[PDB]
Amino acid sequence: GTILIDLSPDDKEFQSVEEEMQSTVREHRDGGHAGGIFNRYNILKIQKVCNKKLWERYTHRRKEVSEENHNHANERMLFHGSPFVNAIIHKGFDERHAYIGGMFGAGIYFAENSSKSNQYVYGIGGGTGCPVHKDRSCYICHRQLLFCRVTLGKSFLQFSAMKMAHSPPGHHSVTGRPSVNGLALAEYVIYRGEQAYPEYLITYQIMRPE
Ligand SMILES: Oc1nc(-c2ccccn2)nc2c1CSCC2
Ligand SMILES: [Zn+2]
């Protein structure tokens, strides 16, 4: 079902995805332990994911959420990093892709900062790093993450952990907001796979700083 269409570096679409990817980078408090040490990426490839079946399920669910939220789906483009990016782009988000130990329970987690999702590309805590060198800060191996369409609808806002099986009643997602003793950066959780579509597949390296 899924077709990958390579975007050209001169396309305005490639450029706006690239800029979001680069501009939403932050320096993490773990000193790069999980995701590596870098200030920016080398963006090699951005591909559009075209799967009609997945898109239609996504738009059908988006319609439902929107009608349940005063005609506002509250859609945003958000990043997702995962060792499962290949299964995701062919068959969609399902419960294998959930982060069970997440602070808001087993849902699918998205970030508005690419570097946050970069921490999960090789696994939770960055796992054991790249398959070839077992280096969480590998500059050689090429990484992939997704820039996704996410339907948040009416989002339930939290500053601290609260483990849930689904979005609270009358809500369609949970947003972790940044706070003093809490999160450094935002996080967004959906508990239904049809509320995200993996629109862009980004191949990149983290860059070694000067
Ligand atoms: O992009 C992300 N991915 C994952 C993740 C976790 C387990 C399996 C697959 N992905 N977690 C988070 C983010 C970004 S928001 C913080 C949590
Ligand atoms: Zn490597």
Pocket flag, ligand 1, residue 188 (CB < 6 Å): no
Residue 95, SS3 per DSSP: helix
- By alpha-carbon position, which residue is closest to atom 9 of ligand 1? 82
Identify whether the C-beta of residue 127 lies closer than 8 Å to the C-beta of residue 40.
no
How far, in Å, is the centroid of ligand 1 from the Cα of 110? 6
| Whole-number Cα distances in Å, 37 to 138, 172, 186 | 9, 35, 20
Q: Residue 108 carries which side chain, given as an amino acid letter?
A: I
Identify whether the C-beta of residue 176 lies closer than 8 Å to the C-beta of residue 155.
no
Pocket flag, ligand 1, residue 147 (CB < 6 Å): no
**Experimental technique for the deposited model:** X-ray
Q: Backbone phi, then psi, for 72, in 5-degree steps? A: -125, 115
Tell me the two tokens of residue 21.
């990817």
Is residue 141 marked as binding? yes
| Whole-number Cα distances in Å, 143 to 85, 163, 191 | 10, 30, 26
Nearest bound ligand to CA 133?
2
d(CA 73, CA 165): 21
Using CA of residue 49, residue 55, residue 58, residue 62, what is the dihedral sign?
positive
Using CA of residue 209, residue 37, residue 88, residue 188, what is the dihedral sign?
negative
| Domain covering 1-210 in this structure, CATH number | 3.90.228.10
Nearest bound ligand to CA 79?
1
Pocket flag, ligand 1, residue 126 (CB < 6 Å): no
d(CA 24, CA 120): 16
Residue with tokens 């849930």: 164
Nearest bound ligand to CA 190?
1
Pocket flag, ligand 1, residue 80 (CB < 6 Å): yes
| Nearest atom of ligand 1 to the alpha carbon of 99 | 7
Resolution in Å equals 2.3
Pocket flag, ligand 1, residue 103 (CB < 6 Å): no
d(CA 135, CA 116): 17
| Whole-number Cα distances in Å, 185 to 28, 31, 35 | 9, 15, 15
Say which DSSP state 97 is in: G
